[PDB]
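#struct-pred
JK: can someone run the complex with magnesium ion? inputs below
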Amino acid sequence: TFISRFAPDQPRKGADILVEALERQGVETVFAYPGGASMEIHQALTRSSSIRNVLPRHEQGGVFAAEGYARSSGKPGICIATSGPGATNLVSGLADALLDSVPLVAITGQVPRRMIGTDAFQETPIVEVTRSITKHNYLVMDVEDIPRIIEEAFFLATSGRPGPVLVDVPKDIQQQLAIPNWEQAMRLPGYMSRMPKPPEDSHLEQIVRLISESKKPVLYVGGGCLNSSDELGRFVELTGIPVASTLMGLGSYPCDDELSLHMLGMHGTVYANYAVEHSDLLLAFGVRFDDRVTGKLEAFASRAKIVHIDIDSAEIGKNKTPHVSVCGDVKLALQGMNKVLENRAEELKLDFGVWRNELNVQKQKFPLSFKTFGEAIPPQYAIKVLDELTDGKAIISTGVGQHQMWAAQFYNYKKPRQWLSSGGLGAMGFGLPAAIGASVANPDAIVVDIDGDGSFIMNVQELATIRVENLPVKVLLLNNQHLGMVMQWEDRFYKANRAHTFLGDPAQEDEIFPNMLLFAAACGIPAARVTKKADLREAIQTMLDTPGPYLLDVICPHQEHVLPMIPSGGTFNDVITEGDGR
Amino acid sequence: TFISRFAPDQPRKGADILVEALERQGVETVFAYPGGASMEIHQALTRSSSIRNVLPRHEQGGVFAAEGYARSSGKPGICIATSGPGATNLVSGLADALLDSVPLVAITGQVPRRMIGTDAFQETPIVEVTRSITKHNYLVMDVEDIPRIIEEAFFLATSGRPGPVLVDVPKDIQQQLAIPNWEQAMRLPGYMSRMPKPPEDSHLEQIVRLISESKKPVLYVGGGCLNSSDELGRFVELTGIPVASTLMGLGSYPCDDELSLHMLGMHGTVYANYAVEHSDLLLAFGVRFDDRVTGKLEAFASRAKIVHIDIDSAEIGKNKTPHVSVCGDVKLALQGMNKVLENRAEELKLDFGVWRNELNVQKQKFPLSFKTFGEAIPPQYAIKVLDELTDGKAIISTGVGQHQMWAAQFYNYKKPRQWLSSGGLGAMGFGLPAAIGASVANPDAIVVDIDGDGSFIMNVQELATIRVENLPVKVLLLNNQHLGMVMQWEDRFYKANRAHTFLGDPAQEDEIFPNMLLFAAACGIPAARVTKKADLREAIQTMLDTPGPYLLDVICPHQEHVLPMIPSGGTFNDVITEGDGR
Amino acid sequence: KLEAFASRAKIVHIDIDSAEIGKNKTPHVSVCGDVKLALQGMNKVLENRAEELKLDFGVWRNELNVQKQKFPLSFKTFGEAIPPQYAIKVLDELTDGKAIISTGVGQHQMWAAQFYNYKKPRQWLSSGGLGAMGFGLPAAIGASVANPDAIVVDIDGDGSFIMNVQELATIRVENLPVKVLLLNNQHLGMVMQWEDRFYKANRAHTFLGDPAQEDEIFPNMLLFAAACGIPAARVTKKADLREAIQTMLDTPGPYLLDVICPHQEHVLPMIPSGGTFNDVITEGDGR
Ligand SMILES: Cc1cc2nc3c(=O)[nH]c(=O)nc-3n(C[C@H](O)[C@H](O)[C@H](O)COP(=O)(O)OP(=O)(O)OC[C@H]3O[C@@H](n4cnc5c(N)ncnc54)[C@H](O)[C@@H]3O)c2cc1C
Ligand SMILES: Cc1cc2nc3c(=O)[nH]c(=O)nc-3n(C[C@H](O)[C@H](O)[C@H](O)COP(=O)(O)OP(=O)(O)OC[C@H]3O[C@@H](n4cnc5c(N)ncnc54)[C@H](O)[C@@H]3O)c2cc1C
Ligand SMILES: Cc1ncc(C[n+]2c([C@@](C)(O)OO)sc(CCOP(=O)(O)OP(=O)(O)O)c2C)c(N)n1
Ligand SMILES: Cc1ncc(C[n+]2c([C@@](C)(O)OO)sc(CCOP(=O)(O)OP(=O)(O)O)c2C)c(N)n1
Ligand SMILES: Cc1ncc(C[n+]2c([C@@](C)(O)OO)sc(CCOP(=O)(O)OP(=O)(O)O)c2C)c(N)n1
Ligand SMILES: COc1cc(C)nc(NC(=O)NS(=O)(=O)c2ccccc2OCCF)n1
Ligand SMILES: COc1cc(C)nc(NC(=O)NS(=O)(=O)c2ccccc2OCCF)n1
Ligand SMILES: [Mg+2]
Ligand SMILES: [Mg+2]
Ligand SMILES: [Mg+2]
Ligand SMILES: [Mg+2]
Ligand SMILES: [Mg+2]
Ligand SMILES: [Mg+2]
Ligand SMILES: [Mg+2]
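RT: done, structure tokens with the ligand placed:
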């Protein structure tokens, strides 16, 4: 049973009830930054012997760290901020967690209840601000509600389609004395009654039947499969269907595998987008048919029967209309379909080697390619060397931009939750704090933040967090001195007319600005810069072998372009396969 | 007349119409950070020969810089961000501008109109998110509306009670060709019909009459008086009434003046709070009776006739019920009352020298005081030396915390808009970006960011902005290695139990962590650290005399406390005048 | 027009809702609180400091009483047609001003406000802010249940009365002594008046009768009362009005009196919307 630090008849502060509510959820780590409206919560945290606090240097760092914790572990991430300016600094993280379906519980202090609505000191209506960028939120109006609301928040954040839940706690409720009741029933009758049931054998056998009748099936795998790598891998054994993955699904099926078509979509491989373009059966498991993937919807999988299995009924038929649909956990659907495939194996005689051979011809004519100019370091090459020296077992977090795409293309993720990247919102500054959360959740792992120079500086203050918490976070900084992805679009569509994409100092144009090594130096983090491709392998090896945190500044020619590229709203026939800024 | 870069019959992109709309408003500076949804706006900016863009390193830096620009100049600040994660990074600045009544126009790119509502790439419903933390906002749904909406946004941001206005612009509207109509009438019939009229002589003479009937009048001056320093000063000549100022009103009446009671409220001077406590006439000009100032409302000015002049009818009677009220521009009310006072001067025979003498006794028994321990640098002393070496003529911006209060107490601001500080929301990380905006708006001024070590690191990335834009921003960093204000409350109310307020490295407890000098070094900004009080004067002098940016790391004992302190919700009889963390 | 309203007065506003103080008109002095307490406090001050104050406004009162004699509320009597103003005055007399009055919305509402002398508050039940037709009959039902011994009269218009005529069944079944004084002008009277003043008497769907039988009272409200077992009568000649109202009052239980009135009557005086005192209309009708 659970052991409380208080007697069952002993009144204690609401802040102490809230912390014990976290303890009763199995919480061991929080990311909490103190302020006036949350001082009581922070005092109660020091009284907890089972919950560790990682103090960020910015609440956006706190929420992004909670995301990295969640994405790398499957557990909910918990961040805590004070009222007013603390709460508003969470907003980008809440939106990011909602768009990527990341389970997250955010607790904000609030001004006393009687002060609400009066423009009080450090008051913002955070429940109103965040209603459209959270899965649910609460304003606690009585200390007796703390056990129930915390329980509901964790249940909502982690069940169904996961997402962020914000709990706003007025300071007077934190100080009120009460005796908690941990037996209160949750008040989610509508939500709980609309929870998907395990899929029926009726629907599952229709799918297995559709597979046997098809000649060109393609698996279309996304973020919803992160807990189904075993079931999915078994499914691929029994069917031999090639696997195309989204940015969010990377690693659900191993990238180094022969049946892997790698990533599809705007910057997906030519052969992955080819497969979807010419398929007759599209198995869309745990995906939401977003515009980065589909392009022009009418042309996406235009001659395929579309099977869509999603745990969110609101996603089924939202953009692309499926032929067959299953609303439920893809993990269960895979388990059920795997049994059918095992028994009726010899009756089905599944063989797609002719389709696979057609795709492997595309895989040989159009592989992912990069150019090497003299001794300049290709960013693609740097990530490939990191893959080798870490044996593809590192947890990878990124910023947003060209380096993000290259980290997606040129690292072979073997398991899900190695890949931590902001996909739906695409928020710069995510990589460094996310690596902080992933390292705390996986203390023995290799954690590398593959960051861009614009993204890295946005939350550079979290270097102090990495040092103080003694986290072995590695930073592989692909430094092209530009806002690279926006620069690439300037080259393609605006005649290379630069509009504020250069991040260096124009007074000293040929100097690396700023000097990221001194940012690491300021926080006592060893660092180095590498410029010549000949030095890169030993440089990365040094970063990995040096215990504790390390920053490697990898200088790269800025004229590189992420390829291939299907322009926004385009079709497969519009794919760009050559060119850069030279 | 205005000269357009386009022919009156020449169609141009909506992005070009939007930039010309800014030009037609007199905009010369914007703070714009590019992204996909705003690329068209940034391209159109490069075509403008009269608008400069200051590229921040974080959109929170962009909005805070726009605030500093506005607060230091009286002109609206303009920041521009892309959709999704760019827009959400503005949120703290919007809330901060609304709570402090700062005029501000924020432009966000948005996904194409047809994509809105579909969870598109980098889409957040920013108009929904910001509705409660902006004065007004817009979603442009037609390119023909751009002239009218921009005009309305600037009008709303700058008229009445100033505040932020957000304008959300879908990317397809930015690309659409049209011929603008600059003659469209605004659609603000309700707002414009409820605008306060110039105050009637009826109301103004009743006030002058109430002054002559009073023995203990106190002026209570706040942020609403920032454009009335001349009228207010003339008013004080004619009446001899002593002036108590809020945090937002500092400098409206000169601090070095003999009639100045300095700041009132929670950390106000004993004599300012004494005056309000025992006054019989309280002239509340441009104030909102916030809880930091009043304490327990029933006890605040409990035996005074309260005259409240506010331009926002919703503020009059919101917390404290006045006897007399004037809803209008305090600038006009002062002008009208000054005429009455000039004519009826000898008939009034105003003399409050007996009340003034009673207050000057309190001013001598309870002045602002600090202690000097050995050679340790008192933060109060450092600010006083900065006052002297700059002759009280520097523009000062701050973070939030103890250093903020000390910068309010120990610098004698001579004019309004020298003092740039986040008062209502109290957002850390404001000081450095605000100094950026103030320097761009006042190129010849001395600009000093008096920052705390927690506040300074939150937006340390803007050091790159200061270097690249070659701005002579000085940073006076009061480094106590703690979240000082929260530490002080731990000492007073939680038995000095530290709950995550220490910002240094516990592994090397007696080392200054992090090393802010290397943060400045990374961005090519000269820096120095001073530890001994004997070295402080020359150190500050060096910072001032060295051309361009400069960071001075001033080490201070952390056990200092901001005094005096009326505890939250307390009365004058609860004021704390002694003690610290020693 | 707000700028012209009390344009040379010091304005004291006592309201229990702080959001109302200074919302439209900016006061000089304000008290946010219960006006009952403010009156009690001010009454004590006035009692004690009575002889020190020497309050006398008889000169101002005399100036107003001159206006009260030159411009009283007036109505015209045409032959034997029943003036609605007269009907309400007769109801006042026969009930001694002690009846609870509820109304619909329109001309009859204004006349019930002008020509009945309410002696106590909560005798007057009328929809003022929203001005919802169909209020009078159900409101009378609630007032009678709350005041079983009172005289309750619904002074209703023919448009307003028919909107919730179904509550006649409620009045019968609950055996409530609700009286209905129906001022029947066969029109949506208040909208008709504005058509006369501002739209050249161009009728736009304000006639409530049957155009096929133009000179017939339509509908027959007496049969509505008959359907619900409620005694009823119609009066057309001013000579018959007093006995008709007396019958309604003396007959125990519910009763409907259909009072036919010339439709060309206008509510006077009238300050046009957004106007000033100098714009007041004091004469004219639809004739
Ligand atoms: C610069 C940039 C470029 C990008 N370009 C690309 C690109 O070329 N290709 C690409 O793929 N992405 C790209 N993206 C990422 C992108 O915008 C989206 O994040 C991604 O494409 C959508 O991932 P998803 O389809 O797997 O759905 P997710 O966002 O991962 O959501 C999971 C889906 O599965 C469902 N689900 C969740 N759990 C379960 C369960 N247990 N059972 C069943 N269903 C479940 C959810 O309801 C939801 O519909 C890019 C991002 C950036 C920032
Ligand atoms: C850590 C911390 C401690 C603080 N402690 C104190 C403290 O001890 N003392 C203190 O004073 N503050 C303190 N504050 C600041 C504080 O919370 C408020 O920002 C400040 O007290 C309110 O300023 P104000 O009363 O002048 O109203 P403002 O926020 O400045 O608003 C201006 C007011 O005047 C009106 N107005 C605007 N323009 C006009 C015009 N042309 N004519 C007429 N009216 C106009 C507006 O409607 C509004 O009502 C502290 C802040 C922090 C962060
Ligand atoms: C908070 C935030 N602000 C602005 C953004 C708009 N974007 C991008 C995009 C694609 O989302 O535009 O739609 S990518 C990008 C530039 C990335 O600079 P880098 O870190 O150096 O990486 P690289 O390897 O050089 O490319 C910007 C400015 C963003 N997403 N987040
Ligand atoms: C975005 C943000 N996050 C947290 C905040 C909560 N607060 C404070 C308060 C008073 O608003 O609490 O109500 S002040 C403060 C600590 C200030 O650290 P320093 O910069 O070093 O300055 P010092 O001279 O040492 O005191 C915190 C943590 C805040 N306002 N903004
Ligand atoms: C639900 C409802 N619908 C329509 C209304 C619009 N109005 C009116 C007004 C003033 O509110 O117009 O602004 S008054 C009126 C006509 C009243 O018909 P009567 O009952 O016969 O009374 P009378 O003695 O003849 O005048 C209408 C149609 C209304 N208020 N409520
Ligand atoms: C410089 O002022 C500080 C500083 C610190 C460190 N803490 C607080 N704490 C409170 O003021 N607590 S409060 O009485 O419940 C309160 C009353 C009214 C409005 C808000 C409010 O809380 C806001 C949270 F700060 N104030
Ligand atoms: C990596 O993808 C990138 C990168 C860059 C630099 N720019 C863009 N631009 C667009 O995609 N423009 S869009 O066709 O109108 C569009 C269509 C659908 C959804 C959103 C949307 O715009 C979002 C703003 F980016 N995309
Ligand atoms: Mg190579
Ligand atoms: Mg870059
Ligand atoms: Mg008076
Ligand atoms: Mg000294
Ligand atoms: Mg500090
Ligand atoms: Mg008569
Ligand atoms: Mg009628």
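RT: quick notes.
Residues 35-48 of chain C form the longest helix (14 residues).
Chain C has eleven helices and eight strands.
JK: thanks, will look after standup
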